[PDB]
């Protein structure tokens, strides 16, 4: 009997806010500023060498 089960059709989509995006988030937090900051200073500059440059 369990194998005979079926699945209902779900909704196509929920509400899409016309003024919120992943790159331009509507509301503010220090989390998004952190993403923009580490994109500016770039990722950790990993050295492949055995001694420091200086």
Partner 1 sequence: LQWGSLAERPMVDRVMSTSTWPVPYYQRLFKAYPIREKKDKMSLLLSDIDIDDTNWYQAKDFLRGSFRGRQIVDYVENNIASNTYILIQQDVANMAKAYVHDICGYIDVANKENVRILSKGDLI
Partner 2 sequence: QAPGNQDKILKWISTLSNKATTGESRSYCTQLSSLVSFYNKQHVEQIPTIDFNEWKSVISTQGLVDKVKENYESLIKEQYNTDAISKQISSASSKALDDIENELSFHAAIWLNAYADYTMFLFELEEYNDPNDYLMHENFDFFRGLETELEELTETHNYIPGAKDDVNLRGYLATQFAWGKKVISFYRHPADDFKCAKATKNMLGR
Partner 3 sequence: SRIINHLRGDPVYQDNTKDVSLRGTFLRGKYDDLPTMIFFTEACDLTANWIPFFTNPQYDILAHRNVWLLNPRNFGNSDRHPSFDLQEMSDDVMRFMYSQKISMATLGGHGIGGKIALAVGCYHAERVTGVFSIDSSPMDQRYHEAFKEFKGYVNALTEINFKTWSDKDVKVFLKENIKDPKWRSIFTNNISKNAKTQSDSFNFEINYLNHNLNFNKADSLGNWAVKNGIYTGRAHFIFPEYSRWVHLATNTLPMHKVCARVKGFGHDIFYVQGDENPLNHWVYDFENYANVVASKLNKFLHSYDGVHALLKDRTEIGNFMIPDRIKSRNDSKHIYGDYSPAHLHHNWRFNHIYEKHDELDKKLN
Ligand X SMILES: CCCCCCCCCCCCCCCCCC(=O)OC[C@H](COP(=O)([O-])OCC(O)COP(=O)([O-])OC[C@@H](COC(=O)CCCCCCCCCCCCCCCCC)OC(=O)CCCCCCCCCCCCCCCCC)OC(=O)CCCCCCCCCCCCCCCCC
- Which of 15, 19, 28, 50: binder of partner 2 (CB under 8 A)? 28
d(CA 33, CA 41): 12
d(CA 31, CA 21): 15
Q: How far is the CB of 36 from ligand X (least distance, A)?
A: 18
For 19, which DSSP code? T
Q: Which stretch binds partner 2 (CB under 8 A): 1-9, 11-19, 28-36, 46-54?
A: 28-36
Q: What is the largest CA-CA distance in the chain?
A: 74
- Give residues in contact with ligand X (CB under 6 A): 52-54
Which residues of the chain form contacts with partner 2 (CB under 8 A)?
A: 27-32, 34-35, 38
């Amino acid at each position: 009997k369990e194998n005979t089960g079926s699945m209902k059709k779900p909704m196509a989509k929920a509400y899409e806010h016309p003024y919120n995006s992943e790159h331009h988030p509507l509301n503010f937090s220090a989390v998004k500023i952190a993403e923009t900051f580490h994109d500016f200073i770039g990722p950790e500059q990993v050295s492949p060498h055995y001694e420091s440059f200086a």
